[PDB]
Design a protein around this ligand. Structure first.
Ligand SMILES: CC(C)CCC[C@@H](C)[C@H]1CC[C@H]2[C@@H]3CC=C4C[C@@H](O)CC[C@]4(C)[C@H]3CC[C@]12C
Ligand SMILES: CC(C)CCC[C@@H](C)[C@H]1CC[C@H]2[C@@H]3CC=C4C[C@@H](O)CC[C@]4(C)[C@H]3CC[C@]12C
Ligand SMILES: CC(C)CCC[C@@H](C)[C@H]1CC[C@H]2[C@@H]3CC=C4C[C@@H](O)CC[C@]4(C)[C@H]3CC[C@]12C
Ligand SMILES: CC(C)CCC[C@@H](C)[C@H]1CC[C@H]2[C@@H]3CC=C4C[C@@H](O)CC[C@]4(C)[C@H]3CC[C@]12C
Ligand SMILES: CC(C)CCC[C@@H](C)[C@H]1CC[C@H]2[C@@H]3CC=C4C[C@@H](O)CC[C@]4(C)[C@H]3CC[C@]12C
Ligand SMILES: CCCCCCCCCCCCCCCC(=O)O
Ligand SMILES: CNC[C@@H]1OCCc2ccsc21
Lengths: 217, 278, 45, 228, 328
């Protein structure tokens, strides 16, 4: 750095560093969420009401908070070979359809939930669980019993009992309750409800992380 | 007599310097400890280090010799440094409390608007308060060193250095206690029992942490500032022994040792960093 | 693919090891990491 | 492309703002120079402003009188000229220049605008060199100070100014050939003496060849050698 | 059935191990490389890096949405290219130095033009056609590039046309790494099915299949003479295969190494094999005797990429720590 144009190169490098720092500051103010769930789980309606060829990125703002939602379910490639890329996301959004007694498919969703929740990268990451398509589930339960999916289910064939049973089966899969929490929501047609639940869950996550940092949690 | 007291004071000063230097070095060695909260903690550690380097040795010398031998100019310099650095340390504690309150009650501000400029501004404010409280005695005021006994100035300095920060810390940490309590309280009976046990454990942790912080603050500083407030107004009858006065004064100074212990060595991130470095 | 992989001409392992050793020895002087390159011509010191 | 405007008749002791509208490239990334040329004399570097305007340099003969500034959003470069003397009369060019490892500064030159107010010394041996197409020609240059830097770069530049055209970079750092320059041109030399060799010269090579050093900030030029 | 024939032929040609033949040559000794340069400026985990053929410039891609081009000698940033998708998992540097490429969880491969007349790096072309994340990419010319993806296939692309001239198929799982031969007429790929295959670029079909790893092969590298390559997989061992012998020659493992390899590289002479680990350490191996010559312990999170200059002068090691260290 002792010649005329070896100093202009250093100035260019300093400008590049300035721009990189600015971009990094800009990107640290955006809440990053990972969206998971089977294809028939209703992720499409969830994304549509948020906004209203591999990874799909969705940006939406709710009450001064910028969310970035990464829909990774578009690619069939091996999951353990890229899931670590999403280490550090604020929360994971998991979509499940309560009408999944066709293929059961509820078993596959439960296996995926167990795999994701107890992953070593997501030890601290909380999960925002959405139990979608409750109306068709209410039609199905009248048509067919839940015993077709849960033979051990001894309760009555009603919305409340079956829905509570499904929620308990999903929340029982996390082996590290001391570290993370699961926020369960039965998705409603009203669009605002889902975004409000996501905002509430993320706000609680941030507050509890701060409380942990202060030593109060 | 002089030997034991000199050894004890030397040990105290050495431990203070070592701890504060370790905190400052750790904040610079590891990249995982560089953030706004850790910037505030490091600034507090630097202030405590400067206390231990500039104020504590002269005070210990005065105490062992039982008399001031460095003259009036050095006496004024020592008083100014002592007041400035102690006030800065107290207000650093206050600024850490304010930062924690904002982080715990305002998450949108935490995500969008929290930047290291916040830490810089808070440190600047703490040092500004210290300078404002330390200047008067050198401007608008030989065998012993003693701070001004003027009633107006003692009230001003005590209220600006301890009682105001004491009140603000109490208020802010009460609000933090309420917030933490609200967040904690917000064939399945086994899981309900487990949840209740976890919530009770977290509440006990909250109480223990707030107790440690506030109790260390109070035990270290409250006796000294109570004595400072009451003595000038009632010197005619408050003939307290020199032993008790020295014990109280060195309780005040000892906060420099305990501040790192509470804010860095008890911090999980800091101790993990220390293990990594060693 | 095994139909073609099974009919490939192969050599002895000893010959392969000898060839690797020969290449390593011939270009030994040309490896700055292997040899202690002096700071005069090292572009990073 | 760079288009300059602002020249014309000026009374002595006046002022004038020269502007260059830059289009077709990332103006914000390029450092910009002003290079002038008296009506019948060689090139003279005037001023330099870096990318982001962090660094500004001036010729000793213009410092204090000339001011250089940028308008990145509008991609316009300005030169404020005050207390203009008679010797300021010259065609003013705006020269593109980007500095990073392996770049080619001074690659693109503007068309210039005429103003009329009504140090490493580098010498070029010859003024005129008669020649006909197909011959091999060598242009020689010499510098008072060694242009070879500790890092190995010899900061010599060769520019060709065809009759009625603005200079175009031929060679940068004494060896490298600017993009679009025919392979006829090759540069060589060492230390304080350099040469430019043209093989199988064609009719388009007729012009004046200027040498320039970029070792130090004054950016001295040569007298210019003409081929005809 | 032919599996038995292949195994029989391999055991028939196996007479003496590489270790025994190499017992006659002296050991390398301690290799104490020290960090000469620390390239900092990435604000996220670095996932790949590549050297320029001039052995001075290098490109590193990270998941902060930027891949930077460094002047390794002075640590200056020549370029900083923003990415449309921040999930870049790989990067490459053209042999001519005119272009760079990258890809990731977006199944496309983006090629950038560094020598644009406009003074800024532009996306020369986006290559689409893979149905899985892009694991690796390597230029052959300024017009040809070979890429591998979690689609379980590799493909050769004609950048000018933008369509894949040849598609390489045969892997049973995600293809994680790829390495061109010195002459760029053959290349090898490592996949999550714990096998490596040698492909003929001209013919477009597999020549040989090498097995022996117990887990996904994360990294692969060609021996400098082009007649051997070294693989690094999750079973915490590197392995050296010979194309002509179609066999394993030597495995580079140690008891206290219990984590997988993410990168592999050779020194100019081929005597040293360097490999990055999830133990955020790079272990230098005496390629001929399997002894660990040294350790480049200077990273904190994980060594995800490393490469040796064509000059052989230095080795750079990127990491999830977000720093690149140049050792020499
Ligand atoms: C836990 C630590 C950090 C704080 C509590 C102990 C502190 C306050 C103790 C330890 C040693 C003590 C000193 C030891 C000796 C003497 C001499 C005596 O004539 C007056 C008190 C004085 C000067 C003591 C003051 C208080 C002191 C400094
Ligand atoms: C006061 C002087 C004269 C003598 C003692 C000085 C040093 C050794 C003292 C002062 C403050 C002390 C610390 C104060 C509080 C605690 C927390 C407790 O859970 C473990 C011990 C620990 C960490 C103490 C260790 C010893 C300590 C560092
Ligand atoms: C009066 C006595 C106690 C000396 C006090 C010296 C203090 C002010 C010194 C000691 C160590 C120093 C720090 C050491 C390293 C760095 C990292 C650098 O990127 C910014 C400055 C910073 C953060 C320094 C600030 C000043 C510092 C805190
Ligand atoms: C991320 C970038 C912006 C770093 C910002 C660091 C700022 C917020 C902090 C870190 C440590 C701080 C310093 C620590 C020590 C002292 C010594 C004191 O006598 C004056 C203030 C001063 C000098 C502080 C000023 C503010 C400071 C430099
Ligand atoms: C200067 C030195 C001597 C002062 C030391 C005072 C410290 C050690 C005292 C003051 C306040 C005390 C705390 C007050 C209240 C609680 C809550 C209780 O559920 C557990 C004990 C705990 C957490 C105490 C531990 C000891 C404590 C932190
Ligand atoms: C008695 C006075 C003690 C003062 C102690 C100050 C200790 C300062 C240590 C500075 C370490 C700097 C490490 C820089 C590492 C990096 O490159 O990020
Ligand atoms: C223990 N020394 C503290 C110092 O002693 C003089 C008065 C005063 C006011 C704030 S701090 C302080």
């Amino acid at each position: 750095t002792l010649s005329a144009e070896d100093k202009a190169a250093v100035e260019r490098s300093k400008m590049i560093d300035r721009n990189l720092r600015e971009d990094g500051e800009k990107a640290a103010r955006e809440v990053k969420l990972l969206l998971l769930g089977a294809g028939e789980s209703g992720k499409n309606t969830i994304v549509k009401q948020m906004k209203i060829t591999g990874i799909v990125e969705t940006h939406f703002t709710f009450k001064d908070l910028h969310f970035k939602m990464f829909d990774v379910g578009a690619q069939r490639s091996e999951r353990k070979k890229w899931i670590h890329c999403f280490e550090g996301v604020t929360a994971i959004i998991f979509c499940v359809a309560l009408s999944d007694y066709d293929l059961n498919r509820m078993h596959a969703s439960m296996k995926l939930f167990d795999s994701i929740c107890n992953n070593k990268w997501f030890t601290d990451t909380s999960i925002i669980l959405f139990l979608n398509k409750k109306d068709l589930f209410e039609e199905k339960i009248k048509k067919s019993p839940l015993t077709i999916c849960y033979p051990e289910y001894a309760g009555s064939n009603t919305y409340e009992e079956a829905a509570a049973y499904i929620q308990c089966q999903f929340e029982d899969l996390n082996k590290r309750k001391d570290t993370k929490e699961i926020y369960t929501h039965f998705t409603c047609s009203t669009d605002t409800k889902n975004v409000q639940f996501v905002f509430d869950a993320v706000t609680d996550v941030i507050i509890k992380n701060n409380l942990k940092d202060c030593g109060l949690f | 007599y002089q030997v034991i007291t000199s050894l004890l004071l030397g040990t105290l000063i050495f431990c203070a310097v070592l701890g504060n230097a370790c905190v400052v070095a750790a904040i610079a060695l590891e990249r995982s400890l560089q953030n706004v909260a850790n910037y505030l903690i490091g600034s507090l550690a630097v202030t405590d280090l400067m206390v231990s380097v500039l104020v504590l040795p002269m005070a210990a010398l005065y105490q062992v010799l039982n008399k001031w031998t460095l003259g009036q100019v050095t006496c004024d310099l020592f008083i100014a440094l002592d007041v400035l650095c102690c006030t800065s340390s107290i207000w650093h504690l206050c600024a850490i409390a304010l930062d924690r309150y904002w982080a715990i009650t305002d998450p949108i501000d935490y995500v969008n608007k929290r930047t290291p400029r916040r830490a810089a501004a808070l440190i600047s404010l703490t040092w500004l308060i210290g300078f404002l409280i330390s200047i008067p005695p050198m401007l608008g005021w030989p065998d012993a060193c003693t701070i001004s006994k003027d009633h107006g100035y003692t009230i001003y300095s005590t209220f600006g250095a301890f009682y105001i920060p004491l009140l603000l810390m109490l208020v802010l940490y009460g609000r933090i206690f309420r917030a933490a309590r609200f967040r904690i309280r917000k064939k399945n009976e086994r899981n309900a029992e487990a949840k209740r046990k976890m919530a009770l454990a977290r509440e006990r942790k909250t109480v223990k942490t707030l107790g440690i912080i506030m109790g260390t603050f109070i035990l270290c500083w409250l006796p000294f500032f109570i004595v400072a407030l009451v003595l000038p107004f009632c010197e005619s009858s408050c003939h307290m022994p020199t032993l008790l006065g020295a014990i109280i004064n060195w309780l005040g100074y000892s906060n420099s040792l305990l501040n790192p212990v509470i804010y860095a060595y008890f911090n999980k991130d800091f101790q993990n960093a220390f293990k990594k470095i060693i | 693919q095994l139909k073609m992989e099974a009919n490939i001409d192969r050599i002895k392992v000893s010959k392969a090891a000898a060839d690797l050793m020969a290449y390593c020895e011939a270009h030994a002087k040309e490896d700055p990491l292997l040899t202690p390159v002096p700071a005069s011509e090292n572009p990073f010191r | 492309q760079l288009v300059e405007s602002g020249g014309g008749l000026v009374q002595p002791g006046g002022s004038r703002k020269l502007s260059c509208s830059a289009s077709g490239f990332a103006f914000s990334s390029f450092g910009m120079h002003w290079v002038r040329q008296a009506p019948e004399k060689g090139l003279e570097w005037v001023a330099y402003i870096s990318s982001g305007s962090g660094t500004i340099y001036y010729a000793d003969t213009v410092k204090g009188r000339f001011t250089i500034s940028r308008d990145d959003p509008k991609n316009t470069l300005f030169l404020q000229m005050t207390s203009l003397r008679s010797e300021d009369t010259a065609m003013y060019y705006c020269v593109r220049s980007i500095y990073y490892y392996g770049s080619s500064p001074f690659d693109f030159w503007g068309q210039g605008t005429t103003l009329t107010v009504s140090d490493i010394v580098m010498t070029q041996a010859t003024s005129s060199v008669p020649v006909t197409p197909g011959e091999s020609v060598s242009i020689s240059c010499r510098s008072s100070k060694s242009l070879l830097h500790s890092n190995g770069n010899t900061y010599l530049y060769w520019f060709l100014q065809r009759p009625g055209q603005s200079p175009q970079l031929l060679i940068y750092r004494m060896s490298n050939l600017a993009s679009g320059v025919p392979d006829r041109f090759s540069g060589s030399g060492s230390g304080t003496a350099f040469t430019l060799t043209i093989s199988r010269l064609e009719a388009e090579d007729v012009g004046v060849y200027y040498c320039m050093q970029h070792l130090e900030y004054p950016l001295t030029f040569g007298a210019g050698t003409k081929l005809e | 059935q032919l599996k038995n024939q292949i195994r029989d032929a391999r055991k028939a040609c196996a007479d003496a191990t590489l270790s025994q033949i190499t017992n006659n040559i002296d050991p390398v000794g301690r290799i104490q490389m020290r960090t000469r340069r620390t390239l900092r400026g990435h604000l996220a985990k670095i996932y790949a890096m590549h050297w320029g053929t001039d052995s001075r410039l290098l490109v590193s891609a990270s998941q902060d949405g930027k891949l930077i081009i460094w002047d390794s000698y002075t640590t200056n940033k020549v370029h900083a290219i923003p990415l449309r998708s921040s999930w870049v998992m790989t990067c490459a540097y053209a042999p001519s130095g005119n272009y760079v490429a990258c890809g990731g969880l977006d199944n496309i491969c983006s090629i950038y033009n560094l020598k644009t007349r406009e003074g800024n790096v532009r996306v020369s072309r986006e290559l689409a056609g893979h149905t899985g994340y892009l694991s690796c990419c390597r230029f052959l010319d300024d017009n040809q590039i070979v890429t591998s993806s979690g689609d379980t296939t590799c493909a050769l692309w004609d950048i000018e046309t933008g369509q894949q001239t040849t598609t390489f198929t045969g892997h049973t799982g995600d293809v994680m790494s790829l390495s061109l031969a010195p002459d760029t007429r053959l290349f090898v790929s490592g996949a999550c099915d714990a096998s490596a295959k040698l492909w003929d670029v001209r013919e477009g079909m597999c020549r040989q299949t090498f097995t022996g790893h117990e887990s996904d092969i994360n990294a692969i590298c060609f021996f400098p003479n082009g007649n051997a390559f070294a693989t690094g997989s999750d079973d915490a061992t590197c392995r050296l295969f010979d194309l002509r012998a179609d066999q394993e020659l030597m495995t580079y493992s140690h008891d206290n190494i219990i984590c997988g390899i993410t990168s592999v590289s050779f020194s100019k002479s081929g005597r040293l094999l360097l490999a990055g680990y999830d133990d955020f350490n790079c272990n230098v191996w005496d390629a001929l005797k399997a002894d660990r010559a040294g350790v480049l312990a200077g990273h904190d999170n994980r060594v995800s990429c490393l490469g040796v200059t064509d000059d052989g002068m230095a080795v750079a090691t990127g990491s999830w720590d977000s720093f690149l260290k140049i050792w020499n």
